[PDB]
Symmetry: C2
Subunit: 288 residues, 2 copies
C-alpha cells in the first residue's frame, strides 16, 4: 500500500543511487550520472517532500552508487572515474579518495563500526579498504558467480565472502539488513533469492521485466525491485506481490516511460525512494 508522496527534482542525469541513514532520518542522499551527489533534507510535507541541501561536486564521471554511515555523518561515492570519495555530509569536503580500481566502480559498503570499505567494480572486482584509502583486499570472483563480501588504525581484521553464482546472474544484488538473506537479478526479472544462514536457494521470483535495483525493507519483510515496468514490491511470507509502483508518466509512450534505477528505504521501512531515468527521485509511503 505505497502511495506517491512527491518528487525531489534535483539532478541532471539519472539518479543512479539513493542513500538513507538510521542516524539521520532527517536526511537522504543521491548519486547521479551528473557526476554529483546531493544531500536532501526531508521535511514533513505534501508538496516539497524533500529539499536540496547540499551538492558534492568531486567525481570526473558518473557516480554509480552512494551510501551513508550508520549515524549519517559521512557519505560515500562510487564512480565511473573509478574513484571512491569519502565526504563529510555537513561540508561536502572529500576526506580521502580511494584510488584502486581500473574499472568503473559500481558499489560501496561500510562495516557496522565504520572502519572498513567494500568497493565493487564493474569487472566484478571487489576491493576492501581502510577508511584512510589504503587497499587491502582485491578479491576477484568467477564471472558466473555473485559475491557478498562482509567483515567483522587496526593491525588486525577479519573478512568473509560468500559465493553463489549462476551463468545468468547479472550482477545486481543486495542483502537483508541483518545480511541473512540476499537476492540477485538474473535477466527478464528472474530474481534469484537465497538464504545465507540456510546455505541453500530459496525460491526465485519473477519480475518478467529487466530489473535495476533491489532493496529489502528494514521494517517489512519485503523486497523491492526496479523495472522498466516500474517498481515491484514483493512480500516473502506470504510470497505474494505487494505492489507495482507504476507512475502515470504523463505522455510518454506506453513503452518509453522513464524507469527506476535505484531504490532506498527510509530508516524505518515506511518510506521508499527511487531515482529515475529522468533525473528525479520519486518517493512513496506505506500508508495506514
Amino acid at each position: 500500500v505505497l502511495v506517491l508522496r512527491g518528487t525531489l527534482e534535483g539532478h541532471n542525469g539519472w539518479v543512479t543511487s539513493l542513500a538513507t541513514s538510521a542516524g539521520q532520518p532527517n536526511l537522504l542522499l543521491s548519486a547521479s550520472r551528473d557526476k554529483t551527489l546531493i544531500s536532501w533534507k526531508l521535511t514533513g510535507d505534501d508538496q516539497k517532500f524533500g529539499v536540496p541541501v547540499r551538492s558534492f561536486k568531486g567525481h570526473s564521471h558518473i557516480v554509480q552508487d552512494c551510501t551513508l554511515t550508520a549515524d549519517g555523518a559521512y557519505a560515500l561515492s562510487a564512480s565511473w572515474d573509478k574513484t571512491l570519495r569519502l565526504w563529510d555530509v555537513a561540508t561536502g569536503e572529500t576526506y580521502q579518495r580511494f584510488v584502486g580500481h581500473k574499472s568503473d566502480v559500481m558499489s560501496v559498503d561500510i562495516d557496522k563500526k565504520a572502519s572498513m570499505i567494500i568497493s565493487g567494480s564493474r569487472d566484478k572486482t571487489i576491493k576492501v579498504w581502510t577508511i584512510k584509502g589504503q587497499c587491502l583486499a582485491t578479491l576477484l570472483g568467477h564471472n558466473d558467480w555473485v559475491s557478498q563480501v562482509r567483515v567483522v588504525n587496526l593491525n588486525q581484521f577479519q573478512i568473509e565472502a560468500d559465493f553463489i553464482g549462476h551463468n545468468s546472474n547479472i550482477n545486481t544484488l543486495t542483502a537483508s539488513p541483518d545480511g541473512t538473506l540476499i537476492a540477485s537479478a538474473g535477466k527478464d526479472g528472474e530474481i534469484m533469492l537465497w538464504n545465507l544462514a540456510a546455505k541453500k536457494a530459496m525460491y526465485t521470483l519473477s519480475a518478467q521485466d529487466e530489473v535495476f535495483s533491489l532493496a529489502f525493507s528494514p521494517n517489512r519483510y519485503w523486497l523491492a525491485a526496479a523495472t522498466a515496468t516500474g517498481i515491484k514490491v514483493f512480500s516473502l511470507d506470504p510470497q505474494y506481490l505487494v505492489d507495482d509502483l507504476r507512475p502515470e508518466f504523463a505522455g510518454y509512450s506506453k513503452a518509453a516511460e522513464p524507469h527506476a534505477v535505484s531504490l532506498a528505504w527510509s530508516a524505518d521501512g515506511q518510506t521508499l525512494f527511487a531515482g529515475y531515468t529522468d533525473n528525479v527521485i520519486r518517493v512513496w509511503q506505506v500508508m495506514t
Copy 2:
C-alpha cells in the same frame, strides 16, 4: 624429547615439503626441487624407517609444497611451474591440473570435506579451486599482510579469509590443526604468533635464526620450526622451548650445515618429519 629415528634418502633436490595423513599413518609424502613427489610407506624400524613407495614425475619445475587428503587417498602438489597437480597416491596419475597462477605457486590446501582447493602463490596471490580445476577465487592481500584463507559439483559455497600483517612478516605460515591459532615467520626467527578466536596477538617467539617452516603438533601443544640453526620445537603453555633438533652434520662447517626446509607431524604428534637442504628427510620421535 625428540630422538632421531632415521633418514629417508630419496630426493635429488631439497625436500621442500612433507605431507602425512590421518587416513594412512602408513604413509608419508614429500616434494622436492627435483620436480617430483615421493610417497613413502613407513614401517616400524630402526634402520629403513621408511621406504620409497612411489614417485610422481609431473611438474616441469620445483614442487614447493605437498599435502594429502584427510583419508590419504589423494596427493596435491604446488609448483614453480605455477601448476597444481592432483594425484592418485596409489597410481601416480595426475587427475586435473590447476592452471591459474602466473607466479610460483607456494602452498596448497583442502577443506575438510575434500572439495575445495586453496592455492597460495609467491606474489602472495591466493586462489581457490573446485577439485575439477576451475578457479573461483583470486583474492590478493597487501604485501605487508599475511592471510589465512578458509572455507566451510556445488553451485553454493562460502569462504572466509583472515588478515593480520606486519611490515616484516616473511610469508611463512601455518595454523593450528583446529585452525584456532596461527604463527608467522618474520625475519631473524621472530615468530609472531596469533590467536584466531581471541582476535589479538599472543606473544611473539624468537628463533634468533632464519626460519623455514612452521608446524603445530596435532597431539601436543607444540609449534615446530626449521632454522639454519636446526629445528626448534616450542611448547606454548608453558611457553618454554622443548628442543633444538640439531643433527651432527658429519663434517660440514660449523656454519654450512644443511638445514631443514619443511616439517610434518605424524598423524598423531608422536613423529616429526623434516626435509633438508640435502635431499633427505630426517625423522624424529617423541619418546617415553
